[PDB]
Design a binder for these strands. Structure first.
Ligand SMILES: [Zn+2]
Length: 264
DNA sequence: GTAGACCTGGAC
DNA sequence: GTCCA
DNA sequence: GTCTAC
């Protein structure tokens, strides 16, 4: 899940929990709770608070309660669902919040990588993990200029620069490869070796890609945007623009898909 | 930079 | 049995 | 998806 997936979850979950008051919280896999460290304290501070709103910052979901904010990261398998407290839980359910009306919010995560933090509202943006986070791609904060300042100062690949959440928030393996394809730029190339015409071009393809994926409810990998993917997950398949077999190597320590003729 | 963690169930 | 994200 | 260790 990247910005489009996390943003879709946000729009689809808010109306199912707004106004509900928390009555109890249960943890079946402690390590998921990062702050406060003691999972018993995390559970007790939320009791009695009402869900007032739900926001997003990069790839993080930000639950807004009475005085606190709950910060949740889904990593690779994390998923949410609301249901009746009288029915059986699905497997791999590690954290559950029970509301005073008999319903509950369930969090599942097969690999157990997800994380959760909670702080008073006014302190959330000044502390980890949201503190040293970059600007939103669909906002004036992100521009061709703000993308150059960072590129003209490093040897690392251009893909390695886009995966970094401090540079720009929200992009992942799927949308980084797609964006670089639409811009005609090889992923393994140096960030400093990019011209101005390329920078602006890359900025424009990232905005148009993230925007499109959102209007389609994200992509279903592992939702209808996966039908619009050009390179991701298409090793040894004819390119949609030129017909050259898509290739797959390894850049920045991650699997990488690209077209050898279209990108350069 | 690229293995190596942190975990687990479908792929081949 | 075993390699993958 | 991220963080850490040669
Ligand atoms: Zn091509």
């Amino acid at each position: 899940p990247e910005l489009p997936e996390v943003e879709t979850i946000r729009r689809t979950l808010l109306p199912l929990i707004v106004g509900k008051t928390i009555e109890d919280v249960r943890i079946f896999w402690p390590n998921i709770i990062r702050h406060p460290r003691d999972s018993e304290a995390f559970a007790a501070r939320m009791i009695g608070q009402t869900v007032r709103g739900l926001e997003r910052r990069g790839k993080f979901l930000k639950f807004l309660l009475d005085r606190d904010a709950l910060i949740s990261h889904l990593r690779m398998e994390g998923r949410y669902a609301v249901a009746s407290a009288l029915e059986p839980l699905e497997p791999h359910t590690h954290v559950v919040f029970c509301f005073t009306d008999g319903s509950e919010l369930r969090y599942r995560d097969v690999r157990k990588f997800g994380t959760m933090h909670v702080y008073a509202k006014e302190e959330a943006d000044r502390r980890p993990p949201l503190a040293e986070l970059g600007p939103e791609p669909l906002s004036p904060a992100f521009s061709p200029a703000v993308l150059a300042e960072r590129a003209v100062k490093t040897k690392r690949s251009v893909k390695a620069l886009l995966l970094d959440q401090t540079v720009v928030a929200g992009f992942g393996n799927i949308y980084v490869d797609e964006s670089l394809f639409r811009a005609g730029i090889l992923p393994g190339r140096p960030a400093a070796s990019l011209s101005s015409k390329e920078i602006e071009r890359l900025h424009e393809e990232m905005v148009a890609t993230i925007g499109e994926a959102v209007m389609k409810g994200g992509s279903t990998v592992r939702g209808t945007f996966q039908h619009h993917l050009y390179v991701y997950g298409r090793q040894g398949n004819p390119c949609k623009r030129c017909g050259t077999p898509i290739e797959k190597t390894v850049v920045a320590g991650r699997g990488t898909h690209y077209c050898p003729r279209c990108q350069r």
